[PDB]
Amino acid sequence: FSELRNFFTGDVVIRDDPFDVWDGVKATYIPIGVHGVRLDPNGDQPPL
Amino acid sequence: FYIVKNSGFVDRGSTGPVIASSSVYENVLKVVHTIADFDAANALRLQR
Amino acid sequence: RAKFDLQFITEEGGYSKPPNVKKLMFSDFLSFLDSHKSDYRPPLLTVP
């Protein structure tokens, strides 16, 4: 009988409490920080 | 403006015109942290 | 930058009914920073 058992012996490992699974998330981004006044780099443009 | 655990000012028995206040006088404050600007204050609020 | 709302109270000397002084808590400041987290230019805190 021993051999018959040892053949039919195989282990498995399972987590006691199932994982809690969620759905995806809409990655929404919002603004942050304060903006100051940036002046044009070239200055007044040539005429005509 | 300053943020502080608790404060007030009571000067009982004084004959002066000011005998109480919701605030205190500048020299009674010990500054141990300085938040530079709105941005920074806001930034700290968001580092959970 | 902040605006301070000044208020005067006269102490008659009869210590019967305690005055109702407007006090601003840390909690309120956070509540402020969260209503403006996205602003693109610093908001004004009215400190009493």
XYZ file of N, CA, C and O in Angstrom:
576
model
N 0.809 -1.207 0.000
C 0.000 0.000 0.000
C 0.839 1.251 0.000
O 0.487 2.221 -0.650
N 1.957 1.216 0.717
C 2.861 2.360 0.805
C 3.154 2.950 -0.563
O 2.903 4.127 -0.804
N 3.679 2.126 -1.460
C 4.022 2.583 -2.796
C 2.844 3.216 -3.519
O 3.026 4.220 -4.202
N 1.648 2.639 -3.379
C 0.460 3.190 -4.041
C 0.160 4.591 -3.552
O -0.335 5.417 -4.310
N 0.444 4.853 -2.281
C 0.206 6.168 -1.699
C 1.267 7.136 -2.188
O 0.963 8.192 -2.741
N 2.520 6.759 -1.990
C 3.609 7.611 -2.390
C 3.497 8.022 -3.846
O 4.004 9.073 -4.230
N 2.835 7.210 -4.664
C 2.670 7.584 -6.060
C 1.661 8.715 -6.049
O 1.915 9.790 -6.575
N 0.519 8.466 -5.420
C -0.531 9.462 -5.319
C -0.321 10.392 -4.138
O -1.107 10.433 -3.188
N 0.767 11.137 -4.223
C 1.156 12.100 -3.217
C 1.718 13.251 -4.008
O 2.592 13.080 -4.849
N 1.195 14.429 -3.747
C 1.652 15.608 -4.446
C 1.067 16.751 -3.671
O -0.109 16.703 -3.298
N 1.872 17.770 -3.405
C 1.353 18.872 -2.641
C 1.046 20.101 -3.466
O 1.488 20.235 -4.610
N 0.234 20.963 -2.862
C -0.214 22.214 -3.446
C -0.242 23.223 -2.316
O -0.478 22.859 -1.164
N -0.003 24.487 -2.643
C -0.015 25.536 -1.638
C -1.048 26.558 -2.034
O -1.016 27.080 -3.148
N -1.963 26.846 -1.121
C -3.016 27.801 -1.400
C -3.120 28.850 -0.296
O -2.866 28.572 0.878
N -3.488 30.062 -0.685
C -3.615 31.157 0.264
C -4.902 30.971 1.063
O -5.963 30.750 0.487
N -4.796 31.063 2.386
C -5.931 30.893 3.293
C -7.123 31.781 2.975
O -8.253 31.303 2.918
N -6.883 33.076 2.812
C -7.961 33.989 2.453
C -7.663 34.437 1.033
O -6.567 34.896 0.741
N -8.641 34.315 0.131
C -8.480 34.696 -1.272
C -8.043 36.132 -1.414
O -8.297 36.957 -0.538
N -7.376 36.422 -2.520
C -6.934 37.773 -2.769
C -8.162 38.618 -3.027
O -9.182 38.123 -3.522
N -8.063 39.893 -2.681
C -9.146 40.825 -2.909
C -8.689 41.517 -4.174
O -7.665 42.188 -4.175
N -9.428 41.322 -5.258
C -9.074 41.903 -6.545
C -9.923 43.118 -6.887
O -11.115 43.116 -6.612
N -9.318 44.144 -7.487
C -10.043 45.359 -7.882
C -10.096 45.555 -9.409
O -9.550 44.757 -10.171
N -10.772 46.612 -9.859
C -10.839 46.903 -11.290
C -9.758 47.933 -11.531
O -9.152 48.423 -10.582
N -9.518 48.275 -12.789
C -8.495 49.264 -13.073
C -8.902 50.623 -12.546
O -9.960 50.764 -11.936
N -8.069 51.630 -12.764
C -8.413 52.958 -12.301
C -8.193 53.959 -13.402
O -7.201 53.864 -14.122
N -9.113 54.912 -13.541
C -8.959 55.939 -14.561
C -7.904 56.876 -14.008
O -8.126 57.542 -13.003
N -6.746 56.899 -14.656
C -5.646 57.738 -14.215
C -5.909 59.182 -14.578
O -5.487 59.642 -15.629
N -6.600 59.908 -13.712
C -6.901 61.303 -13.993
C -5.846 62.227 -13.433
O -5.495 62.118 -12.265
N -5.336 63.147 -14.238
C -4.347 64.062 -13.696
C -4.946 65.443 -13.591
O -5.763 65.839 -14.422
N -4.554 66.166 -12.548
C -5.047 67.518 -12.331
C -3.874 68.449 -12.181
O -2.773 68.020 -11.856
N -4.100 69.747 -12.398
C -3.037 70.739 -12.287
C -2.572 70.999 -10.872
O -3.300 70.790 -9.902
N -1.336 71.462 -10.772
C -0.737 71.774 -9.494
C 0.213 72.917 -9.766
O 0.504 73.227 -10.928
N 0.694 73.535 -8.690
C 1.637 74.631 -8.820
C 1.088 75.945 -9.343
O 0.009 76.005 -9.943
N 1.862 77.002 -9.132
C 1.479 78.336 -9.551
C 2.364 78.790 -10.710
O 3.556 78.484 -10.726
N 1.784 79.510 -11.672
C 2.528 79.990 -12.841
C 2.708 81.492 -12.790
O 1.782 82.229 -12.433
N 3.906 81.940 -13.157
C 4.202 83.362 -13.150
C 4.216 83.897 -14.562
O 3.878 83.167 -15.489
N 4.603 85.157 -14.733
C 4.657 85.756 -16.056
C 6.029 85.602 -16.693
O 7.044 86.018 -16.136
N 6.033 84.992 -17.872
C 7.237 84.757 -18.654
C 7.168 85.692 -19.859
O 6.212 85.627 -20.625
N 8.163 86.560 -20.025
C 8.183 87.494 -21.146
C 8.866 86.922 -22.374
O 9.822 86.167 -22.262
N 8.370 87.287 -23.550
C 8.934 86.795 -24.802
C 10.431 87.020 -24.816
O 10.894 88.099 -24.501
N 11.204 86.006 -25.210
C 12.665 86.043 -25.275
C 13.342 86.964 -26.280
O 14.404 87.502 -25.980
N 12.743 87.145 -27.456
C 13.331 87.984 -28.498
C 13.026 89.477 -28.408
O 13.742 90.303 -28.971
N 11.963 89.832 -27.706
C 11.619 91.235 -27.600
C 10.889 91.699 -28.843
O 10.552 90.895 -29.715
N 10.651 93.003 -28.924
C 9.948 93.593 -30.052
C 10.428 93.071 -31.383
O 11.623 92.891 -31.607
N 9.473 92.829 -32.267
C 9.780 92.339 -33.590
C 10.041 93.477 -34.550
O 9.498 94.572 -34.404
N 10.877 93.226 -35.558
C 11.209 94.232 -36.556
C 9.980 94.543 -37.372
O 9.133 93.695 -37.605
N 9.884 95.777 -37.821
C 8.769 96.205 -38.595
C 8.500 95.626 -39.927
O 9.129 94.734 -40.529
N 7.439 96.220 -40.427
C 6.792 95.845 -41.746
C 6.256 94.470 -41.753
O 6.837 93.953 -42.812
N 1.888 84.631 8.017
C 1.036 84.268 9.159
C 1.664 83.044 9.834
O 2.425 82.323 9.190
N 1.386 82.827 11.123
C 1.972 81.695 11.849
C 0.984 80.577 12.193
O -0.209 80.817 12.387
N 1.487 79.350 12.258
C 0.657 78.202 12.597
C 1.165 77.782 13.948
O 2.370 77.680 14.148
N 0.266 77.544 14.889
C 0.727 77.151 16.200
C -0.278 76.335 16.988
O -1.486 76.531 16.877
N 0.256 75.420 17.792
C -0.526 74.517 18.621
C -1.631 75.184 19.407
O -2.783 74.753 19.371
N -1.274 76.226 20.140
C -2.257 76.939 20.932
C -1.690 78.291 21.289
O -0.477 78.442 21.416
N -2.575 79.268 21.454
C -2.167 80.617 21.777
C -3.300 81.508 22.233
O -4.488 81.193 22.092
N -2.877 82.655 22.750
C -3.766 83.680 23.250
C -2.960 84.659 24.086
O -1.752 84.486 24.309
N -3.635 85.693 24.561
C -2.984 86.686 25.381
C -3.909 87.324 26.372
O -4.825 88.047 25.990
N -3.653 87.074 27.645
C -4.457 87.667 28.690
C -3.497 88.402 29.581
O -2.491 87.840 30.002
N -3.816 89.661 29.854
C -2.992 90.530 30.681
C -3.917 91.118 31.720
O -4.192 92.311 31.699
N -4.409 90.271 32.616
C -5.336 90.695 33.656
C -4.711 91.653 34.643
O -3.512 91.601 34.901
N -5.546 92.532 35.187
C -5.073 93.501 36.153
C -4.359 94.679 35.524
O -4.080 95.670 36.190
N -4.046 94.585 34.243
C -3.376 95.695 33.599
C -4.299 96.907 33.567
O -5.512 96.776 33.706
N -3.717 98.087 33.394
C -4.476 99.331 33.336
C -4.382 99.874 31.929
O -4.966 100.909 31.599
N -3.610 99.150 31.120
C -3.404 99.483 29.722
C -4.711 99.357 28.974
O -5.723 98.979 29.561
N -4.730 99.640 27.674
C -5.991 99.535 26.943
C -6.249 98.130 26.428
O -7.393 97.742 26.180
N -5.171 97.373 26.261
C -5.273 96.011 25.766
C -5.122 95.059 26.927
O -4.104 95.096 27.637
N -6.123 94.204 27.119
C -6.061 93.247 28.209
C -6.314 91.819 27.791
O -6.264 90.915 28.622
N -6.595 91.606 26.514
C -6.828 90.255 26.029
C -6.752 90.258 24.519
O -6.918 91.297 23.887
N -6.484 89.103 23.932
C -6.419 89.033 22.490
C -6.410 87.608 22.030
O -5.934 86.734 22.740
N -6.924 87.380 20.830
C -6.977 86.041 20.264
C -5.584 85.605 19.855
O -5.314 84.410 19.730
N -4.716 86.589 19.642
C -3.341 86.367 19.214
C -2.332 86.725 20.292
O -2.710 86.992 21.423
N -1.051 86.727 19.923
C 0.046 87.052 20.836
C 0.957 88.103 20.216
O 0.662 88.646 19.157
N 2.062 88.402 20.881
C 2.997 89.364 20.328
C 4.152 88.615 19.684
O 4.549 87.557 20.153
N 4.692 89.180 18.613
C 5.771 88.566 17.854
C 6.935 87.940 18.605
O 7.370 86.845 18.268
N 7.451 88.632 19.609
C 8.601 88.138 20.373
C 8.348 86.882 21.204
O 9.278 86.317 21.790
N 7.096 86.455 21.269
C 6.746 85.277 22.041
C 6.753 84.034 21.175
O 6.576 82.926 21.663
N 6.964 84.213 19.882
C 6.978 83.085 18.975
C 8.389 82.562 18.709
O 9.330 83.346 18.547
N 8.531 81.237 18.678
C 9.807 80.584 18.387
C 9.558 79.852 17.079
O 8.779 78.903 17.025
N 10.205 80.301 16.017
C 9.996 79.687 14.722
C 10.864 78.467 14.533
O 12.083 78.582 14.454
N 10.243 77.300 14.440
C 11.011 76.075 14.269
C 10.903 75.433 12.897
O 11.625 74.477 12.603
N 9.990 75.949 12.077
C 9.782 75.484 10.703
C 9.321 76.695 9.911
O 8.566 77.518 10.433
N 9.766 76.813 8.661
C 9.356 77.936 7.823
C 8.912 77.441 6.463
O 9.688 76.843 5.719
N 7.647 77.675 6.152
C 7.098 77.259 4.880
C 7.220 78.459 3.957
O 6.550 79.472 4.138
N 8.093 78.323 2.966
C 8.412 79.390 2.025
C 7.316 80.104 1.248
O 7.295 81.332 1.213
N 6.432 79.355 0.600
C 5.362 79.966 -0.183
C 4.170 79.038 -0.318
O 4.250 77.868 0.041
N 3.066 79.555 -0.846
C 1.865 78.746 -1.006
C 2.154 77.388 -1.611
O 1.674 76.368 -1.125
N 2.920 77.386 -2.693
C 3.269 76.145 -3.370
C 3.764 75.099 -2.385
O 3.174 74.031 -2.248
N 4.857 75.426 -1.704
C 5.485 74.540 -0.736
C 4.544 74.051 0.349
O 4.609 72.891 0.750
N 3.686 74.937 0.839
C 2.742 74.567 1.883
C 1.811 73.533 1.314
O 1.488 72.547 1.961
N 1.391 73.774 0.083
C 0.489 72.885 -0.624
C 1.163 71.538 -0.903
O 0.548 70.486 -0.791
N 2.441 71.582 -1.248
C 3.202 70.379 -1.550
C 3.296 69.454 -0.359
O 3.161 68.241 -0.498
N 3.551 70.036 0.809
C 3.674 69.271 2.041
C 2.350 68.623 2.382
O 2.307 67.483 2.832
N 1.266 69.356 2.166
C -0.056 68.834 2.455
C -0.331 67.571 1.667
O -1.113 66.727 2.101
N 0.322 67.433 0.517
C 0.082 66.285 -0.346
C 1.040 65.102 -0.250
O 0.864 64.120 -0.979
N 2.044 65.174 0.621
C 2.973 64.057 0.781
C 2.479 63.125 1.877
O 2.926 63.221 3.013
N 1.561 62.228 1.534
C 0.995 61.296 2.507
C 1.843 60.052 2.699
O 2.389 59.521 1.736
N 0.802 85.630 1.572
C 0.150 86.926 1.708
C -1.163 86.604 2.382
O -1.793 85.601 2.045
N -1.579 87.434 3.331
C -2.827 87.189 4.039
C -3.453 88.456 4.564
O -2.762 89.421 4.880
N -4.775 88.429 4.665
C -5.556 89.555 5.152
C -5.995 89.260 6.565
O -6.420 88.148 6.855
N -5.905 90.239 7.452
C -6.332 89.983 8.805
C -7.581 90.814 9.138
O -7.626 92.038 8.958
N -8.617 90.110 9.574
C -9.893 90.715 9.913
C -9.854 91.160 11.380
O -9.947 90.331 12.297
N -9.704 92.466 11.606
C -9.627 92.956 12.976
C -10.971 93.101 13.666
O -11.970 93.462 13.046
N -11.000 92.814 14.961
C -12.238 92.948 15.712
C -11.974 93.402 17.130
O -11.056 92.919 17.789
N -12.759 94.364 17.591
C -12.577 94.872 18.936
C -13.698 94.403 19.840
O -14.851 94.275 19.421
N -13.333 94.118 21.081
C -14.287 93.703 22.089
C -14.001 94.497 23.353
O -12.848 94.658 23.765
N -15.060 94.996 23.967
C -14.916 95.774 25.175
C -15.213 94.945 26.413
O -16.288 94.356 26.534
N -14.248 94.881 27.323
C -14.431 94.136 28.558
C -14.962 95.089 29.616
O -14.236 95.940 30.129
N -16.250 94.946 29.917
C -16.940 95.794 30.883
C -16.465 95.548 32.300
O -16.399 96.478 33.099
N -16.143 94.295 32.614
C -15.684 93.977 33.953
C -16.591 92.985 34.632
O -16.238 92.393 35.652
N -17.781 92.824 34.068
C -18.737 91.876 34.604
C -18.429 90.566 33.917
O -18.679 90.408 32.719
N -17.881 89.623 34.668
C -17.501 88.348 34.099
C -18.621 87.308 34.035
O -18.415 86.148 34.373
N -19.802 87.715 33.578
C -20.923 86.784 33.504
C -20.978 85.980 32.209
O -20.782 84.768 32.236
N -21.241 86.639 31.083
C -21.316 85.937 29.798
C -20.009 86.067 29.020
O -19.658 87.150 28.566
N -19.271 84.955 28.861
C -17.998 84.930 28.139
C -18.197 85.403 26.716
O -19.194 85.073 26.084
N -17.245 86.172 26.184
C -17.373 86.667 24.818
C -17.152 85.540 23.836
O -16.516 84.539 24.159
N -17.682 85.695 22.634
C -17.490 84.671 21.631
C -16.396 85.148 20.685
O -16.643 85.929 19.768
N -15.175 84.685 20.918
C -14.057 85.101 20.090
C -13.843 84.176 18.910
O -13.798 82.960 19.078
N -13.700 84.747 17.716
C -13.480 83.934 16.522
C -12.044 83.427 16.459
O -11.100 84.215 16.369
N -11.889 82.107 16.514
C -10.572 81.476 16.460
C -10.433 80.575 15.225
O -11.372 79.871 14.845
N -9.258 80.601 14.602
C -9.006 79.820 13.393
C -8.081 78.632 13.651
O -6.913 78.816 13.997
N -8.590 77.417 13.450
C -7.811 76.199 13.704
C -6.986 75.641 12.547
O -7.252 75.928 11.377
N -5.993 74.822 12.891
C -5.112 74.214 11.902
C -5.957 73.463 10.924
O -5.699 73.470 9.724
N -6.974 72.805 11.461
C -7.882 72.045 10.633
C -8.425 72.959 9.539
O -8.488 72.573 8.377
N -8.808 74.177 9.903
C -9.353 75.089 8.917
C -8.350 75.429 7.823
O -8.733 75.576 6.665
N -7.071 75.531 8.179
C -6.039 75.865 7.200
C -5.860 74.768 6.195
O -5.556 75.032 5.041
N -6.016 73.529 6.639
C -5.882 72.393 5.741
C -7.080 72.419 4.795
O -6.947 72.264 3.580
N -8.254 72.627 5.374
C -9.488 72.685 4.611
C -9.347 73.735 3.511
O -9.974 73.646 2.458
N -8.517 74.736 3.777
C -8.251 75.823 2.842
C -7.378 75.292 1.718
O -7.746 75.340 0.547
N -6.213 74.780 2.093
C -5.272 74.238 1.135
C -5.885 73.176 0.236
O -5.392 72.940 -0.858
N -6.954 72.524 0.674
C -7.537 71.500 -0.173
C -8.560 72.043 -1.138
O -8.860 71.411 -2.143
N -9.096 73.215 -0.839
C -10.089 73.812 -1.711
C -9.385 74.610 -2.770
O -10.021 75.105 -3.697
N -8.070 74.736 -2.631
C -7.287 75.511 -3.585
C -6.100 74.753 -4.170
O -5.324 75.323 -4.931
N -5.966 73.473 -3.835
C -4.839 72.668 -4.316
C -4.439 72.918 -5.763
O -3.251 72.943 -6.083
N -5.419 73.135 -6.632
C -5.125 73.349 -8.042
C -4.927 74.779 -8.532
O -4.386 74.968 -9.621
N -5.360 75.773 -7.753
C -5.211 77.191 -8.128
C -3.889 77.464 -8.832
O -2.873 76.865 -8.481
N -3.888 78.368 -9.813
C -2.650 78.648 -10.522
C -1.974 79.927 -10.090
O -1.047 80.400 -10.744
N -2.451 80.467 -8.973
C -1.921 81.679 -8.349
C -2.468 81.660 -6.925
O -3.668 81.484 -6.709
N -1.582 81.833 -5.937
C -1.882 81.828 -4.512
C -3.173 82.493 -4.140
O -3.469 83.567 -4.639
N -3.967 81.848 -3.271
C -5.253 82.342 -2.774
C -4.989 83.178 -1.500
O -3.894 83.105 -0.929
N -5.975 83.959 -1.059
C -5.810 84.805 0.124
C -6.508 84.262 1.364
O -7.724 84.042 1.367
N -5.731 84.070 2.425
C -6.262 83.557 3.673
C -6.694 84.702 4.552
O -5.905 85.595 4.857
N -7.947 84.688 4.964
C -8.414 85.752 5.821
C -8.250 85.260 7.263
O -8.988 84.394 7.723
N -7.262 85.795 7.969
C -7.007 85.386 9.344
C -7.666 86.364 10.330
O -7.421 87.560 10.268
N -8.539 85.875 11.231
C -9.227 86.715 12.222
C -8.322 86.981 13.406
O -7.476 86.151 13.739
